[PDB]
Amino acid sequence: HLSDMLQQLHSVNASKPSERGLVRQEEAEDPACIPIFWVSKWVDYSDKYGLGYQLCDNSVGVLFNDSTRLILYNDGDSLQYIERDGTESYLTVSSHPNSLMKKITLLKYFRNYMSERLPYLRTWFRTRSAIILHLSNGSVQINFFQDHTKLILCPLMAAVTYIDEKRDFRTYRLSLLEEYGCCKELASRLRYARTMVDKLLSSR
Amino acid sequence: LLCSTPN
């Protein structure tokens, strides 16, 4: 949930992780918390059709402007269609689901554009600082525009994954992180994320 | 404006 998460975030922040006598952020790491999913790439052509995104497993998905979303698996043929209400259909690029060929061409453009158990995007939204991606499996991912750093948050393991400026991958157990603290920068991203999660529950 | 940054 976003409540579990919000609880965990409110918590690590309440603790002011960066105003420490000694910040031993190295110790708050945990290689077993690496989330299974995150958005490798995204494309906001939503002024026209919507947001196309690529999961780290290389499956591509587009959440259209009808709130319908087509997801092409990383094998290239399999499809998942989620209607405006959430019904889930499993078709195929070759099986030809009649009426889906316009939609399927729009996905291949997004697929081609980005390359040139599967959790889809529940919803998203940008602010001037970042784009927020809320995945069905519960993780809120926040990609910050300015310095290209990223926060992927999984409420299932109370874990925060932080891809930084140099492009290094680092996963922290939010609460260990609440024992050892972390540098300013990550501590402020968790505050931002906190605000972002509130909102995912507010406007939701 | 914008998309992911890849490449």
Side-chain angles (χ1 to χ4, degrees), chain A residues 41-46 48-54 60-64 103-116:
Chain A
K41 319 183 193 106
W42 58 276
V43 167
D44 187 339
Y45 202 174
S46 88
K48 262 41 219 262
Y49 332 70
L51 179 129
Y53 65 83
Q54 193 194 73
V60 292
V62 26
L63 161 34
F64 307 84
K103 288 287 190 59
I104 280 169
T105 287
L106 228 185
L107 174 73
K108 253 101 198 289
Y109 159 69
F110 270 100
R111 203 238 340 212
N112 291 355
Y113 193 80
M114 292 191 263
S115 119
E116 164 69 275

Side-chain angles (χ1 to χ4, degrees), chain A residues 73-138:
Chain A
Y73 298 67
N74 75 327
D75 46 73
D77 210 55
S78 309
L79 300 187
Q80 169 181 36
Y81 189 67
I82 297 94
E83 289 138 75
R84 301 190 62 278
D85 55 33
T87 309
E88 300 176 56
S89 306
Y90 294 81
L91 314 165
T92 277
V93 144
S94 60
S95 85
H96 222 104
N98 286 313
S99 55
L100 275 192
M101 298 321 274
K102 298 221 156 60
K103 288 287 190 59
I104 280 169
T105 287
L106 228 185
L107 174 73
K108 253 101 198 289
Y109 159 69
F110 270 100
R111 203 238 340 212
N112 291 355
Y113 193 80
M114 292 191 263
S115 119
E116 164 69 275
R117 48 118 188 122
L118 222 63
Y120 58 98
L121 190 53
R122 271 185 186 134
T123 200
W124 67 290
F125 69 85
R126 25 158 91 231
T127 61
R128 71 126 153 173
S129 285
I131 182 165
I132 290 70
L133 310 165
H134 179 34
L135 294 166
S136 61
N137 62 9

Side-chain angles (χ1 to χ4, degrees), chain A residues 40-42 44 126 145 148, chain B:
Chain A
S40 298
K41 319 183 193 106
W42 58 276
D44 187 339
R126 25 158 91 231
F145 301 146
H148 313 296
Chain B
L1 153 105
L2 291 193
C3 71
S4 56
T5 279
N7 213 335

Side-chain angles (χ1 to χ4, degrees), chain A:
Chain A
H1 289 307
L2 279 129
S3 296
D4 291 328
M5 186 186 289
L6 196 81
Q7 299 180 318
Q8 330 165 313
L9 270 169
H10 164 78
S11 177
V12 348
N13 288 318
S15 67
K16 301 178 14 175
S18 57
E19 304 191 63
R20 210 46 60 75
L22 179 54
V23 183
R24 297 216 302 174
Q25 189 188 295
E26 85 252 10
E27 306 294 303
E29 281 182 39
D30 194 341
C33 286
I34 311 289
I36 287 65
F37 294 103
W38 64 79
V39 175
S40 298
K41 319 183 193 106
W42 58 276
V43 167
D44 187 339
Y45 202 174
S46 88
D47 199 328
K48 262 41 219 262
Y49 332 70
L51 179 129
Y53 65 83
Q54 193 194 73
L55 284 232
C56 52
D57 75 346
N58 280 290
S59 54
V60 292
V62 26
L63 161 34
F64 307 84
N65 289 326
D66 21 13
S67 301
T68 54
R69 31 213 159 204
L70 188 54
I71 285 95
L72 171 45
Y73 298 67
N74 75 327
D75 46 73
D77 210 55
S78 309
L79 300 187
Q80 169 181 36
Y81 189 67
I82 297 94
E83 289 138 75
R84 301 190 62 278
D85 55 33
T87 309
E88 300 176 56
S89 306
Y90 294 81
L91 314 165
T92 277
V93 144
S94 60
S95 85
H96 222 104
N98 286 313
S99 55
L100 275 192
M101 298 321 274
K102 298 221 156 60
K103 288 287 190 59
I104 280 169
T105 287
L106 228 185
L107 174 73
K108 253 101 198 289
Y109 159 69
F110 270 100
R111 203 238 340 212
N112 291 355
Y113 193 80
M114 292 191 263
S115 119
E116 164 69 275
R117 48 118 188 122
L118 222 63
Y120 58 98
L121 190 53
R122 271 185 186 134
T123 200
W124 67 290
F125 69 85
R126 25 158 91 231
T127 61
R128 71 126 153 173
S129 285
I131 182 165
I132 290 70
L133 310 165
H134 179 34
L135 294 166
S136 61
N137 62 9
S139 13
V140 180
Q141 173 175 323
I142 309 179
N143 290 335
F144 296 94
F145 301 146
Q146 242 177 65
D147 59 339
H148 313 296
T149 56
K150 301 174 194 71
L151 270 178
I152 301 166
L153 281 159
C154 176
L156 279 191
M157 15 229 34
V160 56
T161 290
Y162 182 65
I163 314 179
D164 72 39
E165 25 282 299
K166 3 161 151 288
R167 282 135 73 161
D168 253 22
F169 67 128
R170 230 62 136 197
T171 292
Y172 312 97
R173 214 173 210 304
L174 280 188
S175 93
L176 296 175
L177 228 210
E178 198 201 315
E179 236 106 86
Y180 310 104
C182 57
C183 56
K184 207 179 75 291
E185 292 109 39
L186 174 46
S188 69
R189 264 148 189 46
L190 292 178
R191 265 177 257 137
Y192 192 79
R194 183 267 174 53
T195 297
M196 293 313 102
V197 176
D198 278 336
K199 159 177 305 204
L200 282 179
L201 288 164
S202 95
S203 59
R204 192 72 286 96

